[PDB]
Amino acid sequence: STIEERVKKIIGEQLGVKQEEVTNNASFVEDLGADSLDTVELVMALEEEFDTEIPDEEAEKITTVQAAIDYINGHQA
Amino acid sequence: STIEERVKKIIGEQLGVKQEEVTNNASFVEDLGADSLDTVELVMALEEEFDTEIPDEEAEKITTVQAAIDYINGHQA
Amino acid sequence: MKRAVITGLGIVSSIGNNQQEVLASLREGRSGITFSQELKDSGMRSHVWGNVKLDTTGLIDRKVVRFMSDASIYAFLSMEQAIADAGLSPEAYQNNPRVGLIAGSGGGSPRFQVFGADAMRGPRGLKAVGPYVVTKAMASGVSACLATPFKIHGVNYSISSACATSAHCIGNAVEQIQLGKQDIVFAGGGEELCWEMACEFDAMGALSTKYNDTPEKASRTYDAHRDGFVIAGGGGMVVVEELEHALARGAHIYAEIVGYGATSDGADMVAPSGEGAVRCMKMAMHGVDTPIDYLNSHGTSTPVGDVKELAAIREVFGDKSPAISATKAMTGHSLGAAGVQEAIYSLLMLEHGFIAPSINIEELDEQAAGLNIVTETTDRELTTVMSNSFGFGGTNATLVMRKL
Amino acid sequence: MKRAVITGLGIVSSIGNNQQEVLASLREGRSGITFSQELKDSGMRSHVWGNVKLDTTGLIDRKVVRFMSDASIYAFLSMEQAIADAGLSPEAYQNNPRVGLIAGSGGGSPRFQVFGADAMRGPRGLKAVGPYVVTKAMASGVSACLATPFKIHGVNYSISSACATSAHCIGNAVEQIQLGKQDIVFAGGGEELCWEMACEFDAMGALSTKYNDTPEKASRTYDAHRDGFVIAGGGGMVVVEELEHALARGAHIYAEIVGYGATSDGADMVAPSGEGAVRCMKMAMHGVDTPIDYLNSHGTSTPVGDVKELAAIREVFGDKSPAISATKAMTGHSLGAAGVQEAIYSLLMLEHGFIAPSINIEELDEQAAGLNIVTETTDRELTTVMSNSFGFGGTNATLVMRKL
């Protein structure tokens, strides 16, 4: 699976939305119903899925599906 | 501090009695006020003091001070 | 004081995943006890349990289940069943200050309390713990995890009283109806099943260990060779409703709760005194002008516990011979879920006109002589039934239920 | 029905080990918060707590304390104080079916649950667990471990409702008196303090982390730069007594419990909706014909919680808000023990005629505008006081207490 597919799978599973509402410009909070606990676990779930460590300062900027894809794409090696 | 002296130390402090009540034929339940949970904890305390394991079939036989000294003496130190 | 009735129920137990499956098991005397590789692998001496035989994957929406331990999962599924069985729709019970929820567990979540500490001590620290451990592990997890998604606006809390937990939940719900404070209270409980919780009972010497090769024979209340209880998990929920409210909507009414006893032994921490149970049964029978036809005893299959309850029953009833059976010989002991599950078994016996058997009595204990202990499924028109629950700390609860 | 009064108090808290020590701390605005090496060493971000300043080692008889976790120990010491304060001899309250006990904790014992699992997984396995973990870790430990040694024969159970736990315990005790079922009910709670429990709140982002170098400034309810609550431990107990029973024995009466609210948000799992709190306060004021002179707010020092409570207070009271203070800025948040401790602080303010200060407000939150938040100790003749408690799962409790 591509990074985009894997990000969307994680977001869908975490937020309880079908891989169909998980469009690239969707905001976790404004569009996908994420609350403050969701935002904590979503960062953890992305860190686990892609075996990366996302600093708090960078995680606070990851508020949309595309921002998560962009971050993972830019932090492979 | 022989095996006999050590066994009586553990018993007296585990059951909260003066170190003169722990006569060799004193019963934990009949004389020293132990209940069924006290006897479980007392066996554990004897295992810790003497660094030996006491099997369940042999622990059930340890209901008197003499039974404790007899087992400990009969099984090294 | 208003009258309280039961208008719906739901159950997830070792002998069935709904009331139809449970009824069939009770009529057949079917055991819910199986061998547990998990208990054996943990290093325990007891290798048997009353497990819930249900794949719960996907049964609860993500935004709800993220907060839940297994006790809450079982209680939630039981509440869904009870809502449907009561004929209630969201416009009637949601966002309604007259509708409440009282449901508990005996121990929260040992599994998730241990998970949190293990995660904290691992290499990732706080980032491994995650944000959902408190609602899984807190003692009120069962009430919190249900009141929120079912949009409950009335009372919302848990009662905990060891193995009397969900019986006190029902009694407290009845009191809310009696005081006129609520029209409906969902009452019950749940309990997870795991080595994290079970191993501490083994360490006390309270669990059966001599029948691991024959799991369905391990739980054997009143048998001369009983050797401790068999641990179980599950959930149950009943809809407690004010009588005129139920009648006005044409509800199906299982029974009226005509008696509720709650007392304390003030004596031993882990063994019943008998004296508190006598007072508890007498309290629950006060003002009830019909005889007790059937008594579901607490009957855990421990050496000490079974004889004390038998003596209390003999003191309470003397001449009279209520039919008695211990359903835990079939089900195991579901701890905080036991009170509501046994109330439900008693309601099913009342509704369907039979007495479930007290199974695995190969040699009746000498202290049980003279009592009407039923060992084969027996059809009978019942009118009034009683269920007892007792817990560590000398806590007693009794419920009496009667046809309308 | 019957009327309920408080005739005795007992408390072990971060600001004092009895009611006299607490009274002095309240008048002085003294912080109970200290730096915790334990929390820091565990890997947490929050390094501050409201610890009980007492070594309880060896205080309670070995045969009683063997069953007890710290929550039970704190509640037990509080109960001894309350019995003495109420002037109750053993003959008056022991072995008495009309005397009960309703007391809880929010989470049982995370410490001893984790101990049990750690022991089981270590080299000695089951032989390292010992026989006392169930009574230490079960949710009803606080009621079980007290009802047994105090020889309680009436009601005996725990209510749990996260941080509303011991407020619901008091309210349910009042209901037992109102129902005519008990003449005295001891009501309260306890909570242990340990990294095993605290780390799961840090993992949610709920604890203060920016003030570890100035621990007494970390808890700062209604301040614009608050950043989470400060966890605390301790216990409290009150003697709830039927009015004619108290008058007939010449008891000292602190106050009558004239209102008790218990509601549910049915909304968010960890943030209050405000709507449920409005209904809870209105329920507690029903039939109360005097104004609220002082409100002890729940006031946790979280960003989200403080604003929701301020909005609820403004909706209930409008332009006539009572004097308000949040004692948790001094004490920290003792979780299941908070409700009874805050009821006790409110009763001391009522009895001694003063309002304790809401400390550490360097800049008042915008949402508090127009409310009478008291920030300096103020002598005032009070007649009617209110105390709010809220918990996870959307659970709300309110108590209103009034002089006779």
Numbering used by the authors:
A (entry chain D), B (entry chain C): 1 to 77
C (entry chain B), D (entry chain A): 1 to 404
Paper text:
In these pathways, β-ketoacyl ACP synthases, alternatively ketosynthases (KSs), catalyze carbon–carbon formation via a precisely choreographed decarboxylative Claisen-like condensation to produce a β-ketoacyl species. The small, 4-α-helical acyl carrier protein (ACP) is used to shuttle substrates and intermediates to each catalytic domain or discrete enzyme in these pathways. Here, we use this well-characterized system to better understand ACP·KS PPIs and KS substrate discrimination by structurally characterizing E. coli elongating KSs, FabB (KASI family KS), and FabF (KASII family KS), as substrate/intermediate complexes with ACP that approximate states formed during catalysis. Specifically, we propose that the elongating KSs employ two conserved active site loops that open and close through a double drawbridge-like gating mechanism in order to regulate substrate processing.
In addition, C12AcpP–FabB crystals diffracted to 1.55 Å and C16AcpP–FabB diffracted to 2.50 Å. The C12AcpP–FabB and C16AcpP–FabB ASUs both contain the functional FabB dimer crosslinked to two AcpP molecules. Analysis of the 1.55 Å C12AcpP–FabB data demonstrates well-resolved electron density for the 4′-phosphopantetheineamide arm and the C12-acyl chain. In this structure, loops 1 and 2 are found in a catalytically competent closed conformation. Like the catalytic cysteine of FabF, Cys163 of FabB, reacts stereoselectively with the α carbon of 1a to produce the S stereoisomer. The carbonyl group of the substrate is coordinated to the oxyanion hole formed by the backbone amides of Cys163 and Phe400, and the probe’s acyl chain is positioned inside FabB’s fatty acid binding pocket. Both steps of the KS reaction form a tetrahedral intermediate that is stabilized by the oxyanion hole, which is only organized when loop 1 and the associated Phe392 residue (Phe400 in FabF), are in the gate-closed conformation. It is also worth noting that when comparing the interfaces of these AcpP–KS complexes, AcpP’s helix I forms more extensive contacts with FabF than FabB, while FabB forms more hydrophobic interactions at region 3.
